């Protein structure tokens, strides 16, 4: 039983018995020579397979599929389960990219995902069908930082026999181990926070092994003629899922990380607390500053004082309810805007998570081809600006963005 | 208007106003300020797009993805794509399970009989899939026969050609609409790098079959795309819906380390075709080889179709036949030291693999042969070594193994 | 005036007006297109150049040169004002690869280098003579712990005319700004605690702009016949010695770091102090935890109270003396080999600086081929266990050890 | 006994008995667990020295570096090297600059006259220092006729084969001891990677002038070179002293980058030299060309010695004149759309530059023609484009030249 610290250094990495290389090698290669029936009779690459053990220690799950993508990660966790003409309960409050994989490229796949309210529990329980799959959400949803009740929520899942998928790609399993709290899939954009850099495109799905499929799931407790009537469930034990989305879904599909990528992110996972921690201290002190300063309206952040989510973040996230929160300046949409274009240690860009602190007014940017109803509707006020708040000195920050508030 | 080898070494490629660097820079990044796609991916994309003569291309993460992307693009739940039976094994999968449980029907036909095709298309067909040399036959379709059945049906004509590249065969000037390749194999060339292609060719004029094309998007701001991207209207959803919904994007590393590979494409290629017939030749006359399959051979069923359509040489895969059975393949298999026994094919260095003996073992006699799969068949994809080396290789196999 | 955390994430990184990517562009590329004789009239490489104003900054130095290794930029920091026929003086207890380029290799090429013990400061000042061009001393020594008092060596180098040269690795910036002490020269190995992460061999040679360049160095104020005539005093100001090292030394020998290895090292400078801060806590609390153990004999680290450089510790090195210390079990030698053979988290190997825990025994492995009388002489007790502690949980470090101790 | 394309693809290529990976890995390590070098650049070691027929190789940062240690692992200060006078820029920078500082004089000859070596040679002399082609006059020496003067005052003969490759020169086979390249340029051929390497071929007996390989090392626990590793003495000096204190090491991504080249080396370097003539005939023949200086055009003084060395074609770098002096030279390089204007060689794509505009614009038009730069000089790398396509934009560039 080693510490956070030793697992997010240490886990998954065997010494190379050629080399005995104490760094993890890039295996740039596509294919390995064979001793060959009993390889294809029961893919991946050593490089990645570190990353893949690694992140599954951290979550405390029974192991993990590393994809190109956060979108292919989340792609592979539906399909896995969810075939034409099955459903899926989401949370409403997901990030655009996850809505239209959700709203448009999977109904045209006959997958229907049935979007809820996760802060009204009756909402998600009222939208189960014969035919629904799974329910999933963020751990801090999009764009508000919503915090749903994950136990209650798992609870209504186990009641009707679906796992619970949550995307943690906002927590990190430093912030938030979502199997500790009922979920039995976890995603992650390794893309943001997880590889801390804003250098590598990356996803990973981690399964707990706690979920025991049932007669909902055919192909994991059936025999899959891909592989000649093997049973997942019977040979991979808890692992079944896992194992199924490695053999059929990265087979077929081919959404796999690039080595170099894999390295590139242990690198990030290296330091993953300690980036962390820094990330929640720096977020939580900004909240503060911006929630007292006069040239401020509103500030949305769960760890402040009055807000819906307070007892949500103390009781999941007692660490810092992560380092994303958004605010709105006195002087409205132009304001905003000002204060973009003001900003000389913030950078302007549409992406979270990395070391660096990040700003955009989505609806002068990212949303401004909707009309106000559309973007109030999809939670984005005209004065509205989202802070990634990265690892510089508190200090800078705050003179960065007062000096633009003035 | 630039040659073939220029354009493998130039084309997709500016000079950065920046730092004015020659190479290609490296652009792993996340993320861009502002005043989808990435600029090194770009420069192989825009590269590919001219060497086949298409309007554009999108990079995927790899082979598999490319073939998903780019029937995806134009079928969805319901929909049925008509695909020849000769696939790779990771082809067939995907068409006959994972395709299928997405409620896509794909319907195999012997693309040897070009009546098969025109019986196999109905109301709800979507495209017509082939391979320029099957697996694991090497057997090559009519295109433009096949090409004439997809327009008469209002259909794009889908060429997987990983096994030719285009300084083999470009199969837009034969009538295909889309191209996909594996970039894993011989346009990489290296053995290094897993990546993935769609290129299309901006030929096709899309009809009421492929209304998400024709009509508003309400994925993408109720945007029309043969009205805002003309030509360009397939490979533009492409981008701008499936690589962002599913995200099988290809690393900028792994385009860095293709754009090596593409540099040198008509010199690896000429190499490889110029050993693989002297190789298929040599075999094809020992008297312990009882039959070699390869379309350059006199006497093969396909060799009107490579003097035709692949005159420089039909790819530099073939498989060959020892007189001992299953026995003497495994012998060949386990006596070859320069030959690497592997599952992949279109690296450099020549590879070998016994299908029957090891990714096929698990199935009966009778279940291979209906796979094309005979138990003594060894299949070499033929590197660009000393051909002197590779017979001696071979020869020397093959004198471990009995009369 | 920003600070520490801010510089290790942005200094030197300006966004390419190409593309306005967020993270620093690989410029694998030997060469560039030409606008063309007012370049050569008047290299490097644009990922390089990031790493080199970046550690420029967190030294507070005017300028950087990059090289392969900690030992090319030894190499080329004592080859940009020394040539044949010309002295060094430079403490005793040093790296063993810096002793051997000093005392063997160096000394063939005329470059007499004379070793004083670092502790006696008349030994320094005896040593000087006409021919003497500069002091080099180490932050940190080997294998000893040994804290120089930088600010009176300095006294002495400047009363002198010559530079005082600063091997800073064993600390980096986090820990001592060797320049805020008198040192006009510091020197890397990247490749240990810089880069954190033991992927990337990498060196860098930093000036301070601040030491007036004399008769002492003529190469600097007289006419450079390979520029033709170039004065390197009025055309790179205080600059001089860096443009120097780049455009003769760089030039001419070619120890130049790949662009990669930049990349690389740059990683691990983002996350700098959030490492070195950990490093420093991890081993004042394993030094403590061995020094009241019973099974050890006798601890050597700077910060326990009773050590002979305690007192230059808290002047020098207040924010903790490096991560590196040695102990010696109770047993001796057979004693020390047994905890090494028996460790299972600290790796046996003969670098430092990782974000992984380290181990030797260098009287077993490193030094074995030496006499007991030679091992003594180069600070090498027969029982002498180095450790590079790294950023695990301590607990499991504190386990680990102890284990083994038993 | 395998050929060069072969060697070039699998020499000093192992198959790691952790994962089988085909491919050669990336050990971007720093460290090594216990029971100098690094795997991966190991592999790129081996396949030079088989490629020349060495005994063995050091990789270094940069050709300068490979220079810097094959003169320092055998000369100290108050010695002698005697150098051809046509060096490349740094070459010379390094030997009359660097080198004179750390107190060893290289005598510089002109290498058109054999018996200026013989003159320059002393007690003190500790090598003799060539390149295959000379820059920038592209001047073949007399190998076997300098090699002779070597080994007849007991000394080893230095070849940089930069300009070469072992594909079309092998030093060895004509009486250097020790080879050095700038992989940087065709080795590499994809202008990626900067590198150096250092082989020794093992021929040459170690005599009374170099102490340091016949006595015993200080500076590796009183050991004798010649005793340990016997003709693989200098090699292993030169790793165990200078690459370990002076730590000019190849970073291994750079290795793994310049391995890719490697295995496409005869390829390449066939097409460069098939298109170097070609454009050096047409260039000869045009009316707005007063000289071309190439040893394969007839009545070039180096002809007869590009026959007997250099048979496959005296690399792919020369340099043209045009009647118009500076102003048309300075007009053709602002003219050019395919050949790209940087100061590098030994690119895969077609490099130009003017140097007397460019490099060499400081020193006076008498300072520049005394380091044989004339003020029309244009020097070409000629890469592997379509020669079609070359000629074509020379020619472009050509006709907005004055007559």
Same mark, same amino acid.
């Given at each position: 039983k080693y510490g956070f610290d030793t697992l997010q250094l240490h886990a998954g990495?065997?010494?190379?018995?050629? +080399?005995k290389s104490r760094a993890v090698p890039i295996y740039q290669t596509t294919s390995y020579i064979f001793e060959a029936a009993d390889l294809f009779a029961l893919i991946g690459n050593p490089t990645t397979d570190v990353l893949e053990k690694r992140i599954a220690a951290l979550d405390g799950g029974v192991g993990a599929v590393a994809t190109s993508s956060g979108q292919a990660a989340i792609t592979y966790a539906i399909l896995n389960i969810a075939r034409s003409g099955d459903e899926v309960?989401?949370?409403?409050?997901?990030? =655009?990219?996850?809505? +239209?994989?959700?709203?448009?490229?999977?109904?045209?796949? #006959?997958?229907?995902?049935?979007?809820?309210?996760p802060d009204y529990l009756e909402e998600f329980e009222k939208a189960i069908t014969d035919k629904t799959k799974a329910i999933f959400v963020e751990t801090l949803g999009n764009p508000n930082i919503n915090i749903p009740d994950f136990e209650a929520i798992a609870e209504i899942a186990h009641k009707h026999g679906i796992p619970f998928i949550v995307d943690n790609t906002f927590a990190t399993p430093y912030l938030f181990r979502p199997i500790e709290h009922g979920a039995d899939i976890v995603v992650y954009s390794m893309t943001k926070f997880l590889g801390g850099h804003g250098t590598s495109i990356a996803g990973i799905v981690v399964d707990s092994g706690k979920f025991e499929w049932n007669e909902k799931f055919p192909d994991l407790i059936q025999p899959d003629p891909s592989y000649h009537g093997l049973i997942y469930t019977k040979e991979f034990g808890n692992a079944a899922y896992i194992a199924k989305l490695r053999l059929t879904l990265?087979?077929?599909?081919?959404?796999?990380?690039?080595?170099?990528?894999?390295?590139?992110?242990?690198? #990030?996972?290296? +330091?993953?607390?300690?980036?962390?921690?820094?990330?929640?201290?720096?977020?939580?002190?900004?909240?503060?500053?911006?929630?007292?300063?006069?040239?401020?309206?509103?500030?949305?952040?769960?760890?402040?004082? #009055?807000?819906k989510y307070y007892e949500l973040y103390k009781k999941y996230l007692p660490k810092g309810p #992560?380092?994303?929160?958004?605010? =709105?300046?006195? =002087?409205?949409?132009?304001?905003?805007?000002?204060?973009?274009?003001?900003?000389?240690?913030?950078?302007?860009?549409?992406?979270?998570?990395?070391?660096?602190?990040?700003?955009?007014?989505?609806?002068?940017?990212?949303?401004?081809?909707?009309?106000?109803?559309?973007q109030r509707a999809a939670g984005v006020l005209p004065e509205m600006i989202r802070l990634s708040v990265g690892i510089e000195d508190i200090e800078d920050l705050i003179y960065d963005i007062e000096s633009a508030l003035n």
């Open positions: 990495q065997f010494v190379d018995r050629e +080399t309960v989401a949370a409403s409050t997901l990030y =655009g990219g996850t809505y +239209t994989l959700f709203a448009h490229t999977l109904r045209k796949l #006959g997958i229907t995902v049935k979007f809820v309210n990265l087979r077929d599909i081919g959404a796999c990380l690039s080595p170099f990528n894999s390295f590139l992110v242990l690198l #990030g996972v290296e +330091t993953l607390s300690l980036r962390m921690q820094k990330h929640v201290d720096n977020a939580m002190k900004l909240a503060k500053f911006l929630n007292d300063h006069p040239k401020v309206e509103w500030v949305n952040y769960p760890a402040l004082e #009055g807000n #992560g380092a994303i929160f958004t605010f =709105g300046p006195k =002087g409205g949409y132009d304001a905003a805007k000002k204060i973009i274009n003001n900003v000389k240690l913030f950078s302007h860009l549409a992406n979270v998570g990395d070391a660096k602190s990040l700003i955009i007014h989505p609806a002068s940017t990212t949303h401004q081809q909707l009309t106000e109803e559309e």
